[PDB]
Each structure stands twice: as C-alpha cells, then as structure tokens.
C-alpha cells in the first residue's frame, strides 16, 4: 500500500491485473524517502529506479534516498513549469502534447523497456508521478498489449494522491528556504493549485498519444525511433504478463 516519504506510489499490477506483481512500480520522488520506505523497497525486491527528474529538479529536491542495492538511473525529463482553471486544462494538455518529442522522453522509454525486458523489477517516478511517469507507464503498457482502459484506470489512480500532494507542497512552500522549490510548484501554484494541474484527466494522457500517431505514424514507430525492438518488447511481455 505505502512507501513512506514518498506518495502516488503502486504497483501497476494493482489495477493491470494480466500484469505479474512485483514487476513495475511507480511513485512520486523518492528524495525523502525514510527508514520505512528504503525496507518497502527492499521488502519488494525492486532493483532499478527511473528517476525521470529535469536535472534542476534533482538538484534542488536531492537524489532518491534508496537503500543499497538499488541502481537509480538518471533520466532527465523535461518538467511541466514554464472560474477558469479551463486554463489549467488547456495548459496541461498542451505539456502532454509536447511529451513525446521532449528532449529526453525516448531516452527514458528506452531505458525503462530495456530494464524490464531483462527482468529488472523497476520502479518508476518523475516529481509527482503523475505526468511524465504517467505518460512513460502508459506507453510501457500498450507496448505489452493492455486495453486503453485499463491503462487509463492505473494513470488515474493518481488523482487519489492529490491532497497527499497539495500537503506536500504546502510543506515544501514552509521550507522554501532551507530547500529550493521544484520549478512544478512554482507553476502549480501559479494555477492556484487546481485539481487540473494537481491531478490528471484521460485528455491530457490522450494529447501524448495522438502526436505520437501524428508525429511517428504510431506507437510502434515510435518505439522503433526510440531504439526499442520487437525483441525486446516481446521479451518484455514474457516478463510483465
């Protein structure tokens, strides 16, 4: 259920129930993750960490506080910072439409497909674990030939996090100067910390993955682009399913 110090966290096989446990996590940042939380990731036997935080994130918020025996993998992700919360909508919605040509976003595919395709329990996470983690999960998923439903039931699952994460920032704004704030906060905040920036809409995962469709003619080219084989996502789905 929990990872204490961190928030937004499951196993996809929680709700992608054709998918083997213990195989793909994912979560918020781990960069204040306690005792507690480096025993659940040991306890889960995970191995590897996609950190897919922009490196400014990962300088300010601090690495992953994982327990030895862990790999975290730098993937830097280029982050989401710059009544009508229409506004929140439409600015969200335009982020994801940028996701997949973002410089970064295949590299991360890349490595996160080549890791469990080798069998690498990985956990997966960006800042909130809700965009960039949501949008690398998801592709992971259909390459493995899950229905859209129930990618999108595991991608919404992050709407349950939302007032996990509006404490979260609150706490962060407290201690902003002892710690510099991540560049999202700065912007969610902006917005008026809407549930449209805080949480996530089926819209915004459909925005990626239309440009995928129009800018590499599909997913598949798309991997294809991405350097990732039909090898290896056969062998992925051996692994996940």
């Avoid at 996590?25 to 995970?46: P, Y």
């Avoid at 710690?179 to 990626?208: C, I, M, N, Q, W």
Wanted: aromatic residues 6%; positive net charge; glycine residues 8%.
């Amino acid at each position: 259920r929990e990872l204490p110090g961190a928030w937004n966290f499951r196993d996809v096989a929680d709700t992608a129930t054709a998918l083997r446990p213990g195989r793909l996590f994912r979560s918020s940042e781990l960069s204040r993750l306690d005792d507690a939380g480096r025993a659940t990731l040991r306890r889960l036997g995970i191995t590897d960490v996609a950190d897919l935080r922009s490196s400014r994130e990962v300088a300010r918020r601090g690495p992953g506080r994982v327990p030895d025996g862990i790999d975290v993998h730098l993937l830097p992700f280029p982050d989401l910072a710059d009544s009508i919360n229409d506004a929140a909508t439409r600015y969200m919605t335009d982020e994801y439409r940028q996701f997949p040509t973002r410089n970064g976003a295949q590299r991360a595919l890349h490595r996160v497909v080549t890791l469990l395709a080798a069998g690498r329990p990985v956990l997966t996470h960006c800042f909130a674990g809700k965009d960039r983690t949501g949008f690398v999960v998801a592709l992971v998923l259909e390459a493995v030939g899950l229905d859209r439903d129930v990618i999108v039931a595991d991608y919404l699952r992050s709407n349950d996090s939302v007032p996990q994460l509006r404490a979260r920032i609150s706490e962060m704004i407290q201690q902003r100067f002892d710690t510099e704030l991540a560049p999202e906060v700065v912007t969610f905040t902006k917005a008026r910390l809407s549930d449209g920036v805080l949480g996530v809409r089926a819209e915004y995962l459909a925005a990626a993955r239309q440009t995928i469709d129009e800018t590499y003619g599909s997913l598949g080219g798309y991997l294809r682009d991405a350097g990732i084989s039909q090898a290896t996502v056969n062998r992925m789905r051996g692994v996940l399913l």
